[PDB]
């Protein structure tokens, strides 16, 4: 059944190198869904952060339609190993490092719906660059993004669009694996740009990270007040015993330095 | 089964010399599959009682492409999770008190996927925090008291004590 349906599709002349045809010659429209699993290692020094997500791409390839209207056949057939299919050569423009998960069987899924609609799902670990602005460092908010776009195909061949409903989703155990920040807001936007090699379509998801204050309250502010307050208890020592005053004023000043360091 | 580890952040198979796998095909058609795997899993921790806390770390196992109609996971009936004898000895900082074997099947946007989950419970060893934190702090607070026995005229001695013990206290916490 499934194995036969797949066989039928590729027994004919099918080229995974050839872009899927369109009715008006328009570009292949790729709908994108994105599921963040974990956002970790938010490096302020190198201004980057890590994040593992599930990319989900969906386009139409009439050449792959087997059931068409179907209603007598399986809704979709799972693409098995050894069958090539044209896929959007998407990459992450602001990715500095990236890995696919391949433990046991590779972590991918490809479905070929009867009408020719393809679903593509893959786990990807990324290390993205996120320029940060520390003007209010102790109490700041940063905005980190993931950019997704085609590398070779221009605006005439491939166009990205965020899924209509819930384009960006978060796994339930994400905020719990992110102790130092609070993921307050997320946004789903377009970053299509015009380059020297052409105009390339591009999506951009953005998360907003609010830095947790409890740490800075306890490790910075509290202890500094407690340090300044100590320098005051020397106002109550007799003006004759200066050794006591200097010892206080100097030790609290030195400690202040260390703390800041 | 195209099984993967949902909460795995990094994973390696061992391939020194011949790859570390074993596949048996019993006469009745039953297949056995055995493979060594090194993992780096995410384990959200809760430090409310940090010095004396217990964390619970898990390993999730599930199919990636096959849904609930094609593949279903079930823990072996007898001793689903086993530990090697030299495990607790290679884990000096904690004590692996309890383990559990559970199911984490979930309903996603791409379908309903079967999923297992093993869980180990780690109790943080106290001897270290007793010696490196509690003992030395008491020994530090107690020193600040020996200045109550110096004559009220020699304040330089009292301040020197009270301030040095306070500063040291800071460093220790840092």
């Amino acid at each position, epitope marked *: 059944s499934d194995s036969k349906i797949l066989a039928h599709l590729f027994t004919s002349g099918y080229d995974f190198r050839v872009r899927p045809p369109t009715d008006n010659g328009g570009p292949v429209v790729v709908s994108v869904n994105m599921l963040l699993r974990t956002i970790s290692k938010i490096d302020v020094v190198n201004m980057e952060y890590s994040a593992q997500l599930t990319l989900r791409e969906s386009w139409i390839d009439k050449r792959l339609s087997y059931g068409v209207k179907g209603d007598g056949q399986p809704d979709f057939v799972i693409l098995t190993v050894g069958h090539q299919i044209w896929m959007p050569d998407t990459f992450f423009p602001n990715e500095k490092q990236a890995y696919k998960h391949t433990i046991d069987k590779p972590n991918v899924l490809i479905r070929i719906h009867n009408d020719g609609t393809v679903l593509y799902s893959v786990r990807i670990s990324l290390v993205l660059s996120c320029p940060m602005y520390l003007q209010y460092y102790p109490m700041d908010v940063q905005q980190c993004s993931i950019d997704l776009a085609s590398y070779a195909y221009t605006t005439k061949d491939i166009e990205y669009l965020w899924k209509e*409903h*819930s384009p960006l*989703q978060l796994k*339930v155990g994400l905020s719990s694996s992110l102790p130092s920040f609070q993921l307050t807001n997320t946004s789903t936007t377009y970053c299509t740009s015009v380059t020297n090699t052409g105009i390339y379509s591009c999506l951009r998801t953005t998360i907003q990270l609010k830095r947790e204050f409890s740490f800075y309250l306890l490790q910075l502010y509290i202890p500094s007040c407690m340090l300044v307050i100590v320098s005051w208890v020397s106002f109550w020592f007799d003006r004759t015993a200066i050794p006591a005053r200097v010892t206080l004023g100097v030790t609290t000043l030195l400690t202040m330095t260390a703390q800041s360091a | 089964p195209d099984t993967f580890f949902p909460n795995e952040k990094q994973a390696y198979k061992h391939t020194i010399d011949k790859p570390n796998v074993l596949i048996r095909i019993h006469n009745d058609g039953t297949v056995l599959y055995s493979v060594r795997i090194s993992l780096v899993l995410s384990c959200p921790m809760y430090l409310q009682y940090y010095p004396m806390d217990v964390q619970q770390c898990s390993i999730d196992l599930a199919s990636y492409a096959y*849904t*609930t*109609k094609d593949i*279903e996971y*079930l823990w072996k009936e007898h001793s689903p999770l086993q530990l090697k004898v030299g495990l607790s000895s290679s884990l000096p900082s904690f004590q692996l008190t309890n383990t559990s074997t559970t*199911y*984490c*099947t*979930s*309903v*996603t*946007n791409t*379908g*309903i996927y079967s999923c297992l989950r093993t869980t180990i419970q780690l109790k943080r060893e106290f001897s270290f925090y007793l010696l490196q934190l509690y003992i030395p702090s008491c020994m530090l607070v107690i020193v600040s008291w020996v200045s109550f026995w110096f004559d009220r005229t020699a304040i330089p001695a009292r301040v020197t004590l009270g301030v040095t013990t306070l500063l040291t206290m800071t460093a220790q916490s840092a």
Partner: antibody
Amino acid sequence: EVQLQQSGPELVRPGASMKISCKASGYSFTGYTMNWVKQSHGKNLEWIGLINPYNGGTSYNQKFKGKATLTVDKSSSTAYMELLSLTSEDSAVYYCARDGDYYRYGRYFDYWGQGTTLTVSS
Amino acid sequence: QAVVTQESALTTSPGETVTLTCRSSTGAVTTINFANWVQEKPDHLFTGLIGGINNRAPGVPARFSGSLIGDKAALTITGAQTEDEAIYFCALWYSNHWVFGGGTKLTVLG
């Protein structure tokens, strides 16, 4: 105590479509997935489908594929069910039944609603 | 397709031990059927009892218990009570959906 309160009884003409609700209270709404069960005079209990509040995800009985549309409104802790192209056969009592497990699918029923009686007659 | 079968009705006295059974037409009820048991009191009051692997609903009395006696799912009430008189539906999971039984009408003789 947890409670699932469903909308009142409805009377609608064939060809039309109506939507019944299931307002959940007494628990973290987004943690448990919701089932919808149809009890008709003509047959036994039928399982329509289920939806995961937190996820948006749904899974329908092949039978009701296209007849029912499960949705969820997180803000109001309510689960809704659309019923399209209503006919005589759709005249039944529709229950909503919560799944047992917390932020995971346990495949076992907790609490049901009082049911919603839908009457489709021209 | 697949059909679930139950006793039309059963009778038992307060304190005794009754057992309802749930039968699959395709074969023996296995663990991947996640046999569920639901109770229906008069006036359309549904509540779950057992289900999933070996878990039970919040508050389900200790007298209720699930098992796979023979080759079908069972629901044993050890020490039946007056209020235990209701209609019991069992549901089996077949691949991707639930299939309910006809239900068993348990009567506690008073």
